[PDB]
Amino acid sequence: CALDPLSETKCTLKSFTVEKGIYQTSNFRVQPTESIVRFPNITNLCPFGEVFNATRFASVYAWNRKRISNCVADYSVLYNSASFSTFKCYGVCPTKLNDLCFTNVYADSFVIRGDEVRQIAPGQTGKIADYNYKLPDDFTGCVIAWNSNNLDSKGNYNYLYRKPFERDIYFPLQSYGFQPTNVGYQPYRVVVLSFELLHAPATVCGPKKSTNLVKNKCVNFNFNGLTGTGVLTESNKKFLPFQQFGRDIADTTDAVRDPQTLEILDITPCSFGGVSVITPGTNTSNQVAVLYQDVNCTEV
Amino acid sequence: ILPVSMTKTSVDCTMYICGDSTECSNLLLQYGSFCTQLNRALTGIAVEQ
């Protein structure tokens, strides 16, 4: 079904004879020549070292927060570590985090009983989920937790517990009690990474290298984690200083601003059309003619 | 005044549903001959015009 256009016709019809006519067998599509990968030129490494190696984490009722921005995050430095008892990601896959960008990342840092690590997931219910730290049901992020008995047991009673991302600081507060005598009763440290995909420029990005930029030629691309394919071109689409993408009626991206030099690129999908095979019947001839619909003959 | 024909549209349903994605196109094959009978219907309308 790829030998010649008559064999595409026979396969399209699920038939070994083709009767006389014109048959749309396939779509012609010019293939991406190469991949263009484009990311902001900033090179600060993100403070995950500070997040995961702090001397004391906070209580789950009064959980700590850090905002991460203007930096490069090699999430494989975290994901490859044997330390983490769970690394479960919601709305993202941990393999893909290095290929990708976010406008901010928030790290939420706190200590819990090991039995309660279950409650730090989107849509959970119970005393930690509902009265201490609630994740939204559309969460886009990773929950990263490990037992911390060597850091946080003594006993130790400085950690306490009693609304998506609320800090609900009368006082219904009850302490944990952490000793080596406590596996599910042990202290667990947890960090939750929340990723901001809102309509703004990227500021946290994976470590993946940028390429040179290609124009007037069909390429695969990734701009700030926006994967796609097209003929990129310079453009007269007059973006205002705050605008970063242009969009089509179908919600698909139609233009981008390069993160490295802030010029505006059109995205045109690579040249395509219906392919129709004009044939007499196979009882008359195996000779065919091919109509490439909606193309100029120089573009075939 | 009488209408006699209408615009001969045709829709490439694999590119409408799974626009240039092999990951999606391999899932769209599991629904069988829906995409080929949508093309058959729109071709029949277009030849009729």
Binding site: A250, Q293, D294 | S5, T9, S10, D12, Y16
Partner: peptide, 22 residues
């Protein structure tokens, strides 16, 4: 003719008879 007035896989095919054949 004066008084009577795309990439997503949607296409328009031309009629067999042009307005000049009609």
């Amino acid at each position: 003719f004066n008084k009577v007035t795309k990439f997503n896989g949607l296409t328009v095919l031309p009629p067999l008879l042009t307005d000049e054949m009609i």
